Amino acid sequence: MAEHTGFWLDAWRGLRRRPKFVIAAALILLILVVAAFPSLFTAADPTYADPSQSMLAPSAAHWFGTDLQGHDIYSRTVYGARASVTVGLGATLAVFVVGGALGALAGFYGSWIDAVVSRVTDVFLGLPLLLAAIVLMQVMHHRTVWTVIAILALFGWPQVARIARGAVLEVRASDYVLAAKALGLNRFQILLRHALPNAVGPVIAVATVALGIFIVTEATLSYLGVGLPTSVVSWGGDINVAQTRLRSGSPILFYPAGALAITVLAFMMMGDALRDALDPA
Amino acid sequence: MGWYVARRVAVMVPVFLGATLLIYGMVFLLPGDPVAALAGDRPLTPAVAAQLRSHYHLDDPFLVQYLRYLGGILHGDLGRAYSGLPVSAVLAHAFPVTIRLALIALAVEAVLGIGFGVIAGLRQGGIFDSAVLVTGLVIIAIPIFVLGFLAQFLFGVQLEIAPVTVGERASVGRLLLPGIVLGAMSFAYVVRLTRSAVAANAHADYVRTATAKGLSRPRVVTVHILRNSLIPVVTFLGADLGALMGGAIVTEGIFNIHGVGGVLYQAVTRQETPTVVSIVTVLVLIYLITNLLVDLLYAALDPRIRYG
Amino acid sequence: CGGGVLSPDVVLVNGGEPPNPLIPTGTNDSNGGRIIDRLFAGLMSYDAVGKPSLEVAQSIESADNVNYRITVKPGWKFTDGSPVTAHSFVDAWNYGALSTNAQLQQHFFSPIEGFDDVAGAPGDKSRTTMSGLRVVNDLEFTVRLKAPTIDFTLRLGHSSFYPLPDSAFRDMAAFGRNPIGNGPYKLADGPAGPAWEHNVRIDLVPNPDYHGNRKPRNKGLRFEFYANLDTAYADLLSGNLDVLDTIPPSALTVYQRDLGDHATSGPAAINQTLDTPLRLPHFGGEEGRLRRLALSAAINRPQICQQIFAGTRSPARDFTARSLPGFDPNLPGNEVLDYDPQRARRLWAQADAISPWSGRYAIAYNADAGHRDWVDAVANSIKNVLGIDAVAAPQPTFAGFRTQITNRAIDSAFRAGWRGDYPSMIEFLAPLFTAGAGSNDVGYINPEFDAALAAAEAAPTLTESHELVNDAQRILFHDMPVVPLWDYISVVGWSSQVSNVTVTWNGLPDYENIVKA
Amino acid sequence: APLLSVEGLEVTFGTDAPAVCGVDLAVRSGQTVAVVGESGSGKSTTAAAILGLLPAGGRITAGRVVFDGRDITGADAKRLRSIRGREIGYVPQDPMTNLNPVWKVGFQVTEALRANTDGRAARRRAVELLAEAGLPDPAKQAGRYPHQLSGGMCQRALIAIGLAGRPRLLIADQPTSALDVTVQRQVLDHLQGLTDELGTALLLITHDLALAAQRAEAVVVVRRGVVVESGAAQSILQSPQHEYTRRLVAAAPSLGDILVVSELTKIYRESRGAPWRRVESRAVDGVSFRLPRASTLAIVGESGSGKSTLARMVLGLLQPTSGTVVFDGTYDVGALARDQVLAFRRRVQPVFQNPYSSLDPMYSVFRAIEEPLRVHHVGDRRQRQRAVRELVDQVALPSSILGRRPRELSGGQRQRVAIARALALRPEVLVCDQAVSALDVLVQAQILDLLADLQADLGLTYLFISHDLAVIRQIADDVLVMRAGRVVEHASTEEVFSRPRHEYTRQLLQAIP
Ligand SMILES: Nc1ncnc2c1ncn2[C@@H]1O[C@H](COP(=O)(O)OP(=O)(O)OP(=O)(O)O)[C@@H](O)[C@H]1O
Ligand SMILES: Nc1ncnc2c1ncn2[C@@H]1O[C@H](COP(=O)(O)OP(=O)(O)OP(=O)(O)O)[C@@H](O)[C@H]1O
Numbered sequence A: 001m002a003e004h005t006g007f008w009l010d011a012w013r014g015l016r017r018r019p020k021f022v023i024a025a026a027l028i029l030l031i032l033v034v035a036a037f038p039s040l041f042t043a044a045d046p047t048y049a050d051p052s053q054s055m056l057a058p059s060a061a062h063w064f065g066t067d068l069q070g071h072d073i074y075s076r077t078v079y080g081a082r083a084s085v086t087v088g089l090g091a092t093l094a095v096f097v098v099g100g101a102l103g104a105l106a107g108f109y110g111s112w113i114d115a116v117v118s119r120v121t122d123v124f125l126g127l128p129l130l131l132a133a134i135v136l137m138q139v140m141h142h143r144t145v146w147t148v149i150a151i152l153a154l155f156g157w158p159q160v161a162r163i164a165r166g167a168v169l170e171v172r173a174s175d176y177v178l179a180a181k182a183l184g185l186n187r188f189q190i191l192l193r194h195a196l197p198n199a200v201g202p203v204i205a206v207a208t209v210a211l212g213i214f215i216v217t218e219a220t221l222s223y224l225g226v227g228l229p230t231s232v233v234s235w236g237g238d239i240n241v242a243q244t245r246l247r248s249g250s251p252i253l254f255y256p257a258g259a260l261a262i263t264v265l266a267f268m269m270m271g272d273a274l275r276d277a278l279d280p281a
Numbered sequence B: 001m002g003w004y005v006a007r008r009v010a011v012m013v014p015v016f017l018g019a020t021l022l023i024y025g026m027v028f029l030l031p032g033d034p035v036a037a038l039a040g041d042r043p044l045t046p047a048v049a050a051q052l053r054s055h056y057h058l059d060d061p062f063l064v065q066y067l068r069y070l071g072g073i074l075h076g077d078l079g080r081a082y083s084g085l086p087v088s089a090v091l092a093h094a095f096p097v098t099i100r101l102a103l104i105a106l107a108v109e110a111v112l113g114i115g116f117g118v119i120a121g122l123r124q125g126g127i128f129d130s131a132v133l134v135t136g137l138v139i140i141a142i143p144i145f146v147l148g149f150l151a152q153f154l155f156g157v158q159l160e161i162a163p164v165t166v167g168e169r170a171s172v173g174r175l176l177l178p179g180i181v182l183g184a185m186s187f188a189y190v191v192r193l194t195r196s197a198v199a200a201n202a203h204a205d206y207v208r209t210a211t212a213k214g215l216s217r218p219r220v221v222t223v224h225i226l227r228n229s230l231i232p233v234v235t236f237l238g239a240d241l242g243a244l245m246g247g248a249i250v251t252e253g254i255f256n257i258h259g260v261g262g263v264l265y266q267a268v269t270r271q272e273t274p275t276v277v278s279i280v281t282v283l284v285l286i287y288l289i290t291n292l293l294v295d296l297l298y299a300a301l302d303p304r305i306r307y308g
Numbered sequence C: 001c002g003g004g005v006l007s008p009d010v011v012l013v014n015g016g017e018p019p020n021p022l023i024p025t026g027t028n029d030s031n032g033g034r035i036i037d038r039l040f041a042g043l044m045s046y047d048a049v050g051k052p053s054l055e056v057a058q059s060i061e062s063a064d065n066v067n068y069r070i071t072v073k074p075g076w077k078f079t080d081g082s083p084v085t086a087h088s089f090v091d092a093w094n095y096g097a098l099s100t101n102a103q104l105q106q107h108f109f110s111p112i113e114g115f116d117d118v119a120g121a122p123g124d125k126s127r128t129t130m131s132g133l134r135v136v137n138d139l140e141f142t143v144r145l146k147a148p149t150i151d152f153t154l155r156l157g158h159s160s161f162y163p164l165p166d167s168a169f170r171d172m173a174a175f176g177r178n179p180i181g182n183g184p185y186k187l188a189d190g191p192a193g194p195a196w197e198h199n200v201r202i203d204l205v206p207n208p209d210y211h212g213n214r215k216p217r218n219k220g221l222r223f224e225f226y227a228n229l230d231t232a233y234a235d236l237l238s239g240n241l242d243v244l245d246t247i248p249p250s251a252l253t254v255y256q257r258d259l260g261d262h263a264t265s266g267p268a269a270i271n272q273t274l275d276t277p278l279r280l281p282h283f284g285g286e287e288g289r290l291r292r293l294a295l296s297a298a299i300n301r302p303q304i305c306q307q308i309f310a311g312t313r314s315p316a317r318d319f320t321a322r323s324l325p326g327f328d329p330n331l332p333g334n335e336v337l338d339y340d341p342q343r344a345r346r347l348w349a350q351a352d353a354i355s356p357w358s359g360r361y362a363i364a365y366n367a368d369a370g371h372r373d374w375v376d377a378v379a380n381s382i383k384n385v386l387g388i389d390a391v392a393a394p395q396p397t398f399a400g401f402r403t404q405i406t407n408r409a410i411d412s413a414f415r416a417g418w419r420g421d422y423p424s425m426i427e428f429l430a431p432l433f434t435a436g437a438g439s440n441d442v443g444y445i446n447p448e449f450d451a452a453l454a455a456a457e458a459a460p461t462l463t464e465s466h467e468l469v470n471d472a473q474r475i476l477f478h479d480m481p482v483v484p485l486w487d488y489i490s491v492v493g494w495s496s497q498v499s500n501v502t503v504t505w506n507g508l509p510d511y512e513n514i515v516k517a
Numbered sequence D: 001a002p003l004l005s006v007e008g009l010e011v012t013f014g015t016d017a018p019a020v021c022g023v024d025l026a027v028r029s030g031q032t033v034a035v036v037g038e039s040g041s042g043k044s045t046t047a048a049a050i051l052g053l054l055p056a057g058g059r060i061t062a063g064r065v066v067f068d069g070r071d072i073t074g075a076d077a078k079r080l081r082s083i084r085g086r087e088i089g090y091v092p093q094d095p096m097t098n099l100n101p102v103w104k105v106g107f108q109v110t111e112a113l114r115a116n117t118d119g120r121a122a123r124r125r126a127v128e129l130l131a132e133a134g135l136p137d138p139a140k141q142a143g144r145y146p147h148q149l150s151g152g153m154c155q156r157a158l159i160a161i162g163l164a165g166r167p168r169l170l171i172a173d174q175p176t177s178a179l180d181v182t183v184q185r186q187v188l189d190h191l192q193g194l195t196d197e198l199g200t201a202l203l204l205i206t207h208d209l210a211l212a213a214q215r216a217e218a219v220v221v222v223r224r225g226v227v228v229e230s231g232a233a234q235s236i237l238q239s240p241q242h243e244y245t246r247r248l249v250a251a252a253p254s255l256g257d258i259l260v261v262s263e264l265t266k267i268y269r270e271s272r273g274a275p276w277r278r279v280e281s282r283a284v285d286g287v288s289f290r291l292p293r294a295s296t297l298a299i300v301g302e303s304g305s306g307k308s309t310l311a312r313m314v315l316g317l318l319q320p321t322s323g324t325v326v327f328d329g330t331y332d333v334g335a336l337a338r339d340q341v342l343a344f345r346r347r348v349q350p351v352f353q354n355p356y357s358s359l360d361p362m363y364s365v366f367r368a369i370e371e372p373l374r375v376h377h378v379g380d381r382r383q384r385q386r387a388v389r390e391l392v393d394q395v396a397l398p399s400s401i402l403g404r405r406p407r408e409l410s411g412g413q414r415q416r417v418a419i420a421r422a423l424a425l426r427p428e429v430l431v432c433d434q435a436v437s438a439l440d441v442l443v444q445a446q447i448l449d450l451l452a453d454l455q456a457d458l459g460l461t462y463l464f465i466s467h468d469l470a471v472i473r474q475i476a477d478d479v480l481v482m483r484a485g486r487v488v489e490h491a492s493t494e495e496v497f498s499r500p501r502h503e504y505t506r507q508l509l510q511a512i513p
């Protein structure tokens, strides 16, 4: 998606009265409000654990119960929204932009640009994530949200690059590409204006799935001490720690997982509503 | 094209060499010191430690240890694995099972994802499409540990219609439930890619002509619509063939499989450099080869795609 | 229909891949330790309680606990026809003591005279043999120590004083791939494959030549190597395993339901502690003694040991384990190990009256070993009782967590603990709190404690060395070099086929007299 | 009782005015009925409603279609499926977008003939069907992909597909718009031999008014979705009564050098047999001519002759195997290099053969037409709006279209959109490629008048490729006949139309309705 000029005013009007778009936008707005102002929804401290209240059932005092340590689960699932949403959205946008640009450049030119980009992709694609995280985080004096985003994006862009390259390969032999060349455009203007809008669906799909994948992988990183300091509440850290209480019959894993699934659903609906505005019917 | 394939296979060599150097560097740069863990949770005598450090050549300069590693892979001779074994034996014991399991998982996910995706893209916005999408997102949200735990519980403990463990006996029939579990995180990807492509291609001008011939809906759908909508999903499947190996550590722990992911994790946590370097190098080889094969498959799938 | 072959005679137990070749002086873990202990039989033997008794020796005579005369029994042999002599012990001890051989158990030979000559640095000093050991016949030899040691004869049951056959020093690397012992079991004969499939299993059969204290009641054992103990629990519930030997933490509350009289429990000789180097800021001097005394009054050990561990740990009452001979749970002064938030805050206040607290208090541990829950609990209780910010710190690799402790370069508190090698209290105290000990990771120096501990080894009898150890432990109560947390309790479950499962003094099953029929 | 009856059909496209407003027509199972009319009247929408193949947003409202005495307007897609192959055949309008581009033409023809097994005899019935459709070497053509075919060869392939299951009725949508006159005579007399000794019926939608006169038996005139006239052919095509049909029958066709091409040659390498057994196809062979400035040069010839290849080589869009195209003396179109390119592309503009595929499915009509103006920086924002509106009005196109995408246009409206996009910049040279073809006579007249005005006032130069010989005799200044890639005859317009000195160009000159 580079140049959809012309009538964004008609698209936006055609996108307004689209119930899927409206519902997805309302859900996204709610999620953002929860991630921005957590103190409207709860008064408790997410990092306070009274251990004489280890694993209680939901009541009027604790709406979701407590966990093995004694934390309030409602407070923790309200305050994990900031970290989880920030990491997921940041890494998704980063890999989308970077991998899409790289793969679309590779698939369109194809002489030596393709060679270098595809070899770098084959190297980055076979190198594990935990090894490189362990090696790189020995120089970062402080873990943050942005270091986690940087790691996740730097090792997640290749599979988006592959899909974008494959998508542009099919398009670059079309007849409107020759017509654009015969009008007088250069290869870069052709690329943007004609070949980005026409080959952008698959990338949207893989991005909408990579969002939830990233939100889950950040916990893998945090658990070993190479990401996101332990004083930070997050969805995924809670799932990781609470999955072990499941044999005893305690279903406290499904409270952060429910929020994660709702956010992923909202963004999938939004992505499809945006993708159905490039070939309306 | 013969000359294009020749150039590709030729340039595969120097990238392989540079990748070996870069991988050895990043594995060397792990923060600890292997000798400090050779005795486990007890300390070594300061003379026994010196002896072991000199025995494993852990006091040579970098690039001397690298040249020693690299010049010896011309005889096999990949290293010596502080447990005392050759590394050749370790890799030969660990790779066959992983290859078999990865092939099973790829086949399962391919068949299932393509079927559900073609139907959900032919009739999108309906009950079937909604159910498929919510199944994908529910699979994403729930950790693979829980999925493997519950699947094993059910189908191996209550309904004994599957092995609980596949240790030491890894048939193509005993590795079927582990394969289904392993190929479940790659379900939403395949479904969504197939759905997008099929929805885009379901309204071309030649599909109307194929309908006017008098073909049945299955034949029209399959031949025209499906055959014309296979490139992004094949891209993803080729790229995921390599991630199915080296990254199935959680599934191989639930079922006692003894694959490559556990070997890699142990070698990393004990800082055994030759083992890690060999495994990661083999992974990079697999990726190079599969990407070349998938490009040739592009050329076979679309006659207007030609390289030069 | 093919395959399916069942094991109606061998007992199927769980294990793990030995990380080293199977040599007695080269293994220090438990995964290889259990196999080595099945394979060999040394000068003394322990029962399930930990009482030593003569196995290969006729007599071990001494009159001053410095010079020992050891007599070997005639008739014993290795499983190749070659006899067991005095040379078999002397050669093996000298092999394990020398420094050019680079054996992990070298330190176990410290008390013998001549140890430095062989355990210094090669070439510098000659004498590849220790001078304290001296052969008199093929069935007798003498030992001489540096100082009186009441605790010596008890060590001769450890798997480091085992003999070796003379067809073992000609090529040792080969021996460690297929050992030849003289104990109750042998490696399964073989003619289907190897007896040891790496990362898979090890098969053992009885030894017809063994006439000792640990005669087997099985028709063989099979150690099946698992990762992820939850899988071993699933196989025990399915009927594919016979003895589990340890319950996973996720099943600690439901095993009473699932197994149901096919489980037993008993105390093991293991403990756990929390260490803070005496060189950190604010943790040195008297100002650091008060802080270490206040950190122990701020931990609820009874609450942690039954909310986090569900009853598989026991709150600490001294600096040793509960299962050891001579343990006293009412030592005068151990009320420094009770939970008392007012006392904790008072001690913190009077340490801040010397120098105020400044920063963070972190407890470091290695990730993926099961320490997350109790480290979280300890840090949280400290944070709630005092005002400070205490946190947990997982480390990526095990090598790297060990390097920072060995180099004396770690900059925070860390988790620690001991695993006893033989049933003695002094073995839980000497390698940890003496001046320049190897496992003295916090840098604690006290010549008065050193003298009080050396005065207990020089006691005329074992019944009054215990009193002296318990008196030496008051210095530790006063100084608090490390914060003791809890002792272990081992829970072992089994199937309906096996019939005689029992826990031993170190928390392992008694493999020899498990009855399967 | 007639074989096919349509009475009162009305088709709507997703909350708009009905594209078809009460059409009536019958066919009588042994005859030919032609459907002539304006460009946008609902002639292709009427044929898609009969078969049940309407585009995504269209559906019948208030009408009925009764075929063979069995009302088929409620789909019931088993009643329609037993009909679509065996009883009614279909020939689409666009030759290029209507074949699957990945399936090797012979496969697609063998697939259509069914209700039989034949084993390996189906692959020999397909070659015969392609030979009857009029291909010159079917066994080779059956081994090619659609993009390795000419534009008229794809159309003959679509005909061979539409005649596969032996239909009792054929609906052909402009089936000869890319066949010259001789292939056209062959296919039409084959169809006329079919509508006897069997009884097959033809519903023929054409813009060529002469052909109908000698081929049809009844004529239906359509205008804005209404059947204006209907009756016998002659009594309508020679003595009309309605005003529209009068004007239509009347305004029908009757009866210093900028470019120096020298020795051009193009040779494709194809894979006939084993994928390593390469053959050679000489598309163009040693062609060379010269174009005097401010004049018109027409290029005629047979189907599969190498005219679009030559056009795209002249435009710098193909690379020759040999030869040169020297434009203006300075530019060597085979090698411009970075800076001559924009000044060359401002002065030379193409119009492609079937212009639907070159129209960027995501652009609207306004954006498509103004892209030239904004690539070359003519006006700011509103000058471009005024220019695009003036062009749209000049090409005889409604203003309500601005905002619609190419998929939802007519077949003769896409062509005019491409013509307007070409004329936007007022280029010094316009390379047309069979683009007056989908327009009826009364719109084509206005387009040609505009072209003549532009050449009279500015001095533009035209390179006109076409299969219609009544138009070429009316506009062209020189004629160039091609065959098998070689130039047969290059002479003035009269000396090729009056005293031709080649047997082929004489034959080609006596085949015309
Ligand atoms: N998919 C569509 N969506 C909306 N309107 C359409 C669509 N297809 C066609 N139309 C409208 O229907 C009208 C008639 O279309 P149709 O293609 O039947 O004309 P036609 O007779 O085939 O013209 P010609 O063959 O001369 O180009 C046109 O004015 C067009 O605007
Ligand atoms: N991509 C290709 N590969 C191989 N052969 C081709 C290719 N494109 C065209 N040809 C061949 O080149 C020849 C010239 O075709 P061309 O399109 O120039 O004919 P044309 O004169 O435009 O025909 P028509 O007037 O019917 O459109 C044809 O015989 C065709 O088979």
Ligand SMILES: [Mg+2]
Pocket (backbone or CB within 6 Å): D043, D044, D093, D410, D411, D412
């Ligand atoms: Mg039409």
Ligand SMILES: [Mg+2]
Pocket (backbone or CB within 6 Å): D150, D151, D152, D307, D308, D353
């Ligand atoms: Mg052509």
